[PDB]
Structure 1
Amino acid sequence: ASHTTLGVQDISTTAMSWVQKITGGVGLIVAVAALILIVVLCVSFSRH
């Protein structure tokens, strides 16, 4: 062959889009759930 080899970061444009959507979606679920816990914790601390 007259060209160099490829690395792990070389991925088609179509394949990259699917990875972004999946990781972003799952991350949102953790982010929303985290905020509810913090709000409740402050109320217990202050009210006592």
Structure 2
Amino acid sequence: HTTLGVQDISTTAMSWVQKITGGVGLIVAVAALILIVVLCVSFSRH
């Protein structure tokens, strides 16, 4: 009957592009946390 809202296909290919986005977000989140950790180390050092 068609006439509906996606999304739908095309798997693989679709994953190829999707995988490119969000990874860098995780990286900068981890780096942010690490910077906080080091900051706390300095706070402890003082």
How many matched pairs?
46
TM-score when scaled to structure 1?
0.53
Q: Alpha carbons of 1:6 and 1:18: their partners in 2 closer, same or farther (altered >3 Å)?
A: farther
> What fraction of aligned residue pairs are identical, expressed as a percent?
100
The structure in which a higher percent of residues are helix is 1
Q: Which runs of 4+ in 1 moved over 6 A?
A: none
C-alpha root-mean-square deviation of aligned residues, in Å?
A: 2.3
Q: Quote the offset at 1:42 in angstroms.
A: 0.6
Q: Alpha carbons of 1:22 and 1:31: their partners in 2 closer, same or farther (altered >3 Å)?
A: same
CA distance in 1, matches of 2:3, 2:17: 23
Q: Quote the offset at 1:28 in angstroms.
A: 3.3
Q: Alpha carbons of 1:14 and 1:25: their partners in 2 closer, same or farther (altered >3 Å)?
A: same
Deviations 1:15-39 (CA, angstroms, capped at 9, x unpaired): 4312331124323321331232122
Corresponding residue for 2:39?
41
- The runs of 5 or more residues in structure 1 that have no matched partner are none
SS, match of residue 8 in structure 2: coil
